[PDB]
Every structure is written in C-alpha cells, then in structure tokens.
C-alpha cells in the first residue's frame, strides 16, 4: 500500500473544497472532493457512450462513434440520437478534465510543491476546448466539432484538413509542428544525457553533471544546463500545443480558403511581384 517513505507525507490538509471530508486515499490514489467529481463525470460519460453504442447497434470499439449534431441544428440543443448525446458527453469530458486538474492542485498543496503540472495540463484541456467549443461557436454549429470514435476522429482530421487544401500550408500549423519535432529532439537528448552520466562505461565511476555540461559544450559549443533543459522542455511542449490551438481557431473563422493561397501575400509584394523569372514569374 505505501512506498517505503510515504507515511510522513500523508498529513491532513491542502484541500480546496470541503475540508477533511474527502481528505483521504484509496490504495495509492488520492481522492479529495475533486477525486469524487471526476469519478462522477467519468461514470456518467462512459454510460452515455455505451447508450450511444446501442442506438448505433454495435459494441465493437473500432466501430463505435458518437457524432455531434448536424450543422442544421446550429448551436442549439439536438435530440439524443441526433446529437444531444455527444453534447452531454462533451460536457462530461470537460467536467472530468477540469476536475482532474483541480485534484492535481489539491495534491500539490498537500505536498508543498509548485503548481507547474496542473498548469501545463490546462494547455491540453484548452486545445480540446478549442476543437469542441471555441471553434464550433465561433463557426456557428456544434457540427464543426470532431466525433468521439477511434477512427472516425482520424477521419474528421483528414476531411477538415483537406477542406482548406494541403493543411501543411497553414502557417501556425508549420510553427506548431516545429515545436513537436523540436521537443521530441530535446526529450531524446535530455534523457540520453542524464542516463549516460548515471550509467557510464563499465567499471567507471558515475559521471558528474559537470561532465554532462562538458559533453555538450564539446558537441555543439553550448550547454543550457540542468535547470535550463527542464525549463526548455516545459516550454517547447506548452508551445507546441499553444500553436496547435491557434492554427485551428483561425481555420474556418478568419481564413476559409485554401491555405496555400494565403502565401500569395508574400509573393505579391509590389517590389518583386512583377519581376519576371523564378517560379512565380
């Protein structure tokens, strides 16, 4: 049940809501008021999802799919079988997510650490809200949201993309991808760096951080340092997801045409717009 050093940490307090009421654990897990909140939202949501599955007449997970209301319903409510169920399920997800974040906050307090983790998570939550709330509202129907199904959701991605041409040309999409790639790169090296220091060559003594710093200074002529790379990681990650939201929130709202075409602005600057030759002249 407890890690060899856990007991002295399991003291009362830190709860945001409800005092000592839910201030307790279940196996390794911490409950807290929000422990309960998330459970309830999670229970409800899964139920509704199964209920959608009978109306659909399949129990096969590769097939199950809960779709939003069709565009004709705009931002109004829709019949269960006709889009209501997704709308509730979406409400329930949100409930789950936010609650899961606030529990993280409550654990943070009991342990006496910073709130960076709940913090970073809120970016994930905000990306999800962008795709099922902010964008549809702004566009004008729940129908612009993505459906909850394993492959159907990949389909929405593909269809929504190809609507504006090759989505690769969405400029904030370019930026968002550069982080995803960059972050992975940085996770790769950070993990590798620490391990190589902690797990050297056979029979050798554990390297020191100083060796870690030297290794990079030797490799590319600069080392951000131990504190740096952790600040770096948090940032690349949060940024990747920040730009991911951005590229979507603008798509279909302030730009509805082909993304490639938006680049004509550059190429049509009057100082070289008419100069012959090249690719565009």
């Amino acid at each position: 049940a407890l890690l060899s050093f856990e007991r002295k940490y399991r003291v009362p307090g830190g709860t945001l809501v409800g005092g000592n009421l839910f201030d307790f654990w279940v196996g390794p897990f911490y409950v807290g008021f929000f422990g309960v909140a998330t459970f309830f939202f999670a229970a409800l949501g899964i139920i509704l999802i199964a209920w959608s599955a009978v109306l659909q007449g399949t129990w096969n997970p590769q097939l199950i799919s809960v779709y939003p209301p069709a565009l004709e319903y705009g931002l109004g409510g829709a019949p269960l079988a006709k889009g209501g169920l997704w709308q509730i399920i979406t409400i329930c997800a949100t409930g789950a997510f936010v609650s899961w974040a606030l529990r993280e906050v409550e654990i943070c307090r009991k342990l006496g650490i910073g709130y960076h983790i709940p913090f970073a998570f809120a970016f994930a939550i905000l990306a999800y809200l962008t795709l099922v709330l902010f964008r549809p509202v702004m566009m004008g129907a729940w129908g612009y949201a993505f459906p909850y199904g394993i492959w159907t959701h990949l389909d929405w991605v593909s269809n929504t993309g190809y609507t504006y041409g090759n989505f690769h040309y969405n400029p904030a999409h370019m930026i968002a991808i550069s982080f995803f790639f960059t972050n992975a790169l940085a996770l790769a090296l950070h993990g590798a760096l620490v391990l190589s220091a902690a797990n050297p060559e056979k029979g050798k003594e554990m390297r020191t951080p100083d060796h870690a710093d030297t290794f990079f200074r030797d490799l590319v002529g600069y080392s951000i340092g131990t504190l740096g790379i952790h600040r770096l990681g948090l940032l690349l990650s949060l940024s990747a997801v920040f730009f991911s939201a951005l590229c979507m929130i603008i798509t279909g709202t302030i730009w509805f045409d082909q993304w490639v075409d938006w680049w004509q602005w550059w190429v049509k600057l009057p100082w070289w717009a008419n100069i012959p030759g090249g690719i565009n002249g």
């Binding site: 890690l3 060899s4 007991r7 279940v26 342990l111 003594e205 554990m206």
Partner: protein
Amino acid sequence: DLASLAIYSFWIFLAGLIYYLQTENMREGYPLENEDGTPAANQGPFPLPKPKTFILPHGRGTLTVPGPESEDRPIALARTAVSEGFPHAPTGDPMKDGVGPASWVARRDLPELDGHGHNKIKPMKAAAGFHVSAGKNPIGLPVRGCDLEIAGKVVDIWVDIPEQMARFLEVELKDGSTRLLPMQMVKVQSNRVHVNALSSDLFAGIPTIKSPTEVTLLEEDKICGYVAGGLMYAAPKRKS
C-alpha cells in the same frame, strides 16, 4: 504477410519494454508497506528488479538499489482513523518535527562536490571571481516575511559554481546569526526580498548549518523542507 508480422512483433517488443521500464522504477521506496511499516501483502505483478550498484566519484563509496530502506529518523505522526487510507496527524509541531510538506530526507551529511572534488555550492564571498552579472543584487536588501514584517537582511549569495546559478540567499537575523533561504522560494524586489512561505517569527526556526562556508545534502533537505512547509503551516500568520 510481412507488415502483419512486423506490427505483431512490435506490440510484443513494446510489452516487454514497458515491463522493463516499470521494474527499473521500482528501484526506490519498494517494496510497499502498511502504515505500520510491516511489508504489504500485494506488491503488484512486477518483481523487484535485480540490484544495480553505482560507483560514486570522489571515493564516496557505492550505492546499491534496490536495497534495505529505512527512514533513519523518528516520524511524529499519529493515525486519525482505525482503517487504512486516512491522514496521519502531526503529534507536535510539523515544522519543528519535519513531517508533512515540511518533510526532509536523511541524505548524507556531506556536501555535493563539483567535477574536481570541490564543494559545488559556496558563499559568493569565498567564490573567487563571481559577481551579479544581471538583475538586482539582493545583497544588502531586508527580508520581509508573509506577515509583512522585516526578518533580516541579505549578507551574501551562495552560488553554484558549476552552473553559475544563485541557489540560496544567506540572511542575517536580529540576533546576528544567519540562515540560508532557497533562491526558489523568494521574490527579489527593487527595495526588498519578500518570502511568502515564512512569517517573520519563523525564520529563527530555519535549521542552521554546522560550518559557515559549506552546506550538506542533509542540511539542504532540512532547510528546503522547512521553508516549503511554511506554505501550509504558517498559513494563519499570512495576510495579504
């Protein structure tokens, strides 16, 4: 076909890999225990990994994990219920006792050494060539506690020579003794240094270091521990 082969293969690879990953993270704090310290009955599907021994750099010995675990300090906590899973209430002053968000681990009572075998962290007055290259130099500014009362002054910056990083502010109290304050728990302002976790009256309780030009892993933990714990336990004294 080949493709089918490859993907089935991979899902198998991936499964033994997680297994590996998982057993490696079982190198500390395992095996599990009951609230009374007796070994718990259900330790999960995963076995303890076979021990590994770390050879430490400045003839400081070896470390073998997993290995015999022991807190090596008495814990001042008492059960608040008759069944498992409820908090344990401090039986004294959690701060003074070092439980809760004020907990510290019995790390070695030796300082962390640099790549050369010198003390990694030093008061800047003893660090030959170091200076505040940017930002507000704290040195000389009053330390204000969450109760909005002055507790001491900044009489030096203990720097991390290898990372050229400020780790702690050395604060002079009203009785002429000094304490270390983690850099990460204070806001350096234009005319003062503000500490939200501790009220002026608790600065004296901050554990002291035995030698004035060195800190040990044990003393770092006891200090950081203490200051962090203020956040929850000084709470009645904090106003804003």
